[PDB]
Amino acid sequence: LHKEPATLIKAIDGDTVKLMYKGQPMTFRLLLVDTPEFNEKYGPEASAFTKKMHENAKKIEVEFDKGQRTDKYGRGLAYEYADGKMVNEALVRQGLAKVAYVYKGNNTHEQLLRKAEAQAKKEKLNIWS
Ligand SMILES: Cc1cn([C@H]2C[C@H](OP(=O)(O)O)[C@@H](COP(=O)(O)O)O2)c(=O)[nH]c1=O
Ligand SMILES: [Ca+2]
């Protein structure tokens, strides 16, 4: 896998964001995770967390996996990095997302994220409290 550039257009919620990629506006859905919807518990905090991560970042990158790059809704499916830090992993590690939607062939970072989730559960953070 490799990182490719992108720039923030707009924060959306815990696991979606509007980015410019190859000069086109795209909604991205973060691979292998599920945040609560904004109207759910830990939704607002998940959204804040991802927004803060985007807005503090000097450099946003996206990384496609080996499979499908777009979902059925036209959302880009990627791992996102903010200043080299994976937003998908940071959400899990903080108990603001669950590992989810692990489809065969787009699951390169599954075990990295499961390790983060096990630590968040251990610490009883947020979703796991
Ligand atoms: C994360 C992800 C979601 N999706 C689709 C499956 C789910 O379909 P349904 O909409 O039919 O439930 C939906 C979940 O995304 P959200 O959690 O953003 O709703 O997005 C994929 O197809 N591939 C993926 O990698
Ligand atoms: Ca969601």
For residue 60, count CB atoms less than 10 angstroms from its CB and return exposed for 0-12, middle for 13-18, buried for 19 or more: buried
The domain in which residue 38 lies consists of 1-129
Residues 6 or more apart whose CB falls under 8 angstroms from that of 117 comprise: 92, 93, 98, 99
As a residue count, the chain comes to 129
Q: Which of 93, 87, 107 is nearest to 47 (CA)?
A: 87
Instruction: Measure the CA–CA gap between 104 and 100, rounded to whole angstroms.
Output: 12
The two tokens of residue 56 are 């503090």
**Alpha carbon nearest to ligand 1 atom 17, residue:** 34
13 is in an annotated binding site: no
Q: Is ligand 1 within 6 A of the CB of residue 29?
A: yes
**Alpha carbon nearest to ligand 1 atom 22, residue:** 71
Residues 72-78: contacts with CB under 8 Å, at least 24 apart: 73/27, 73/29, 74/27, 75/16, 75/26, 75/27, 75/28, 75/29, 76/19, 76/21, 76/26, 76/27, 76/28, 76/29, 77/28, 77/29, 77/31, 77/106, 78/28, 78/30, 78/31
Q: How far is the CA of 35 from the centre of ligand 2 (A)?
A: 5
Q: Report resolution (Å) to 1 decimal.
A: 2.0
**How was it solved?**
X-ray
114 to each of 7, 96, 98, how far by Cα in Å? 28, 13, 9
The residues annotated as belonging to the active site are 29, 37, 75
Q: Which of 116, 124, 18 is nearest to 62 (CA)?
A: 18
71 is in an annotated binding site: no
Instruction: Measure the CA–CA gap between 31 and 20, rounded to whole angstroms.
Output: 18
Count of beta carbons in the 10 Å neighbourhood of residue 8: 15
The two tokens of residue 106 are 């787009």
Q: What is the CATH number of the domain that holds 57?
A: 2.40.50.90
State the total domains in the chain: 1
15 is in an annotated binding site: yes
User: Under a CB-based contact definition with an 8 Å cutoff, are residues 101 and 34 in contact?
Assistant: yes
Q: For 30-42, give the DSSP string.
A: ETTEEPPPTTSTT
Q: Is ligand 1 within 6 A of the CB of residue 119?
A: no
